[PDB]
Amino acid sequence: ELTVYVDEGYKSYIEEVAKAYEKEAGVKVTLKTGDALGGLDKLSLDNQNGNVPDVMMAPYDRVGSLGSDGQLSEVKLSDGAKTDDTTKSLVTAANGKVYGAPAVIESLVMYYNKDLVKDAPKTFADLENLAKDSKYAFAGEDGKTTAFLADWTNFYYTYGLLAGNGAYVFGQNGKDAKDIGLANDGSIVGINYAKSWYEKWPKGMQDTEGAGNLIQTQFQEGKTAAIIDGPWKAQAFKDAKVNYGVATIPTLPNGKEYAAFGGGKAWVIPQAVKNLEASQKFVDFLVATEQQKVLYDKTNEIPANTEARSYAEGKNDELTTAVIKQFKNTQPLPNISQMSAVWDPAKNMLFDAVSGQKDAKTAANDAVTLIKETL
Ligand SMILES: OC[C@H]1O[C@H](O[C@H]2[C@H](O)[C@@H](O)[C@@H](O[C@H]3[C@H](O)[C@@H](O)[C@@H](O[C@H]4[C@H](O)[C@@H](O)[C@@H](O[C@H]5[C@H](O)[C@@H](O)[C@@H](O[C@H]6[C@H](O)[C@@H](O)[C@@H](O[C@H]7[C@H](O)[C@@H](O)[C@@H](O)O[C@@H]7CO)O[C@@H]6CO)O[C@@H]5CO)O[C@@H]4CO)O[C@@H]3CO)O[C@@H]2CO)[C@H](O)[C@@H](O)[C@@H]1O
Numbered sequence: 603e604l605t606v607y608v609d610e611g612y613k614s615y616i617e618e619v620a621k622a623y624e625k626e627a628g629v630k631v632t633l634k635t636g637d638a639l640g641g642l643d644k645l646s647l648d649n650q651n652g653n654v655p656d657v658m659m660a661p662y663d664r665v666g667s668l669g670s671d672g673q674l675s676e677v678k679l680s681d682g683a684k685t686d687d688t689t690k691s692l693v694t695a696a697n698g699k700v701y702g703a704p705a706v707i708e709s710l711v712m713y714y715n716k717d718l719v720k721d722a723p724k725t726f727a728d729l730e731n732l733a734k735d736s737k738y739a740f741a742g743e744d745g746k747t748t749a750f751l752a753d754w755t756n757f758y759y760t761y762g763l764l765a766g767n768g769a770y771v772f773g774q775n776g777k778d779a780k781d782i783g784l785a786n787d788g789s790i791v792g793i794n795y796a797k798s799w800y801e802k803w804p805k806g807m808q809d810t811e812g813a814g815n816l817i818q819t820q821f822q823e824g825k826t827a828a829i830i831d832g833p834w835k836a837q838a839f840k841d842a843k844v845n846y847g848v849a850t851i852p853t854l855p856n857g858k859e860y861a862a863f864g865g866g867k868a869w870v871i872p873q874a875v876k877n878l879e880a881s882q883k884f885v886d887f888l889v890a891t892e893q894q895k896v897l898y899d900k901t902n903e904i905p906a907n908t909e910a911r912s913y914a915e916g917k918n919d920e921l922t923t924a925v926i927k928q929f930k931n932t933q934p935l936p937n938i939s940q941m942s943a944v945w946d947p948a949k950n951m952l953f954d955a956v957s958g959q960k961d962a963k964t965a966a967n968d969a970v971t972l973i974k975e976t977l
Pocket residue numbers: 609637638639640643661662663664708753756757758811812813814815832834865866867942945946
């Protein structure tokens with residue numbers, strides 16, 4: 603009498619937690635598996651028919667947009683959830699009602715192959731030097747490298763590059779939707795720097811679709827020293843038996859930190875659930891210290907619950923350490939409605955600039971005009 607919709611990578615986790623929740627309270631938790639973002643895309647239509655899962659996971663930006671749009675029930679933050687000021691703020695929409703319980707904090711980090719390299723690269727000049735070295739030449743197209751790869755046409759990925767250089771999405775720390783900073787001078791240096799890398803990379807890095815699969819394949823097959831990716835990738839890398847280390851993203855050519863979004867995920871409850879109390883109850887259990895520790899144990903993702911998070915910090919694995927440092931150098935993932943209009947124009951900006959189809963400034967100005975349109 604309760605259904606949880608999650609990504610495959612959480613199946614084992616939810617199976618175990620369900621088994622315990624059934625023992626503690628008297629509720630049967632059945633799981634439905636599928637694309638997380640895709641489940642949220644259809645939420646509005648599922649709310650129309652009543653056929654919604656009882657609990658699902660959302661990135662914080664989507665907690666804000668889906669919440670602001672009426673698609674989500676309000677969520678209560680129990681004492682057991684062990685939230686802090688920053689995780690509370692990440693699940694509070696502009697209105698500002700609470701539409702999720704914090705489950706994960708995350709930042710992009712640098713994964714590197716310990717079989718290929720002795721130490722973590724520290725600067726972007728280090729990554730550029732690996733580009734020079736010849737075991738990383740790409741077959742069939744030269745002179746291209748796979749020494750360092752990042753999915754820099756995904757705005758979530760590139761953002762930190764632009765922001766480290768002075769770019770911003772919205773003014774007043776992601777709140778002022780009228781002041782867009784994606785076409786400032788710093789943003790343009792970020793974009794131009796991105797371009798220089800695309801000019802050293804396989805043309806497939808510019809593919810309209812699966813650059814993500816190319817990156818993953820190259821790294822797992824021992825062809826790339828370093829990539830930038832999220833903690834969610836860890837389960838897969840362990841499966842691929844990759845001998846990976848994790849470090850903070852190397853400092854930029856300007857010496858500044860790669861200022862990735864300070865993001866993560868919450869447990870959310872669709873607006874159309876039969877029984878909100880029952881859903882809140884399982885959510886309280888999921889964010890309770892024990893289940894949050896088990897989340898770290900099963901996925902290596904960093905718990906939002908501050909007690910469970912200290913546990914992960916104590917475990918002191920390279921990934922947790924890097925996520926924690928990196929999170930100090932982030933600005934929070936914006937959760938105002940208007941963020942939802944940013945991702946697509948920004949992605950097109952990046953494709954157009956790095957391919958040289960538009961110059962960087964023009965691509966940015968065009969992206970900003972289109973974002974301005976949508977809000
Ligand atoms: O090689 C290209 C591409 O390949 C992969 O991407 C796949 C996806 O796996 C698959 O889901 C689908 O993507 C669809 C997507 O399903 C649609 O919803 C839509 O995506 C929109 C989205 O709806 C918008 O909200 C906005 O997304 C933002 C997002 O809201 C924001 O939070 C952030 O997302 C990052 C997130 O916060 C992180 O947690 C993480 O998400 C992980 C989870 O942690 C993990 O638990 C599990 O669920 O997988 C998630 C990854 O899917 O990373 C997120 C960043 O990747 O930023 C995004 C913007 O990126 O905008 C998007 C785009 O308009 O459309 C897309 C595309 O049709 O199909 C693609 C294949 O193309 C790979 O994952 C990706 O990195 C590669 O770039």
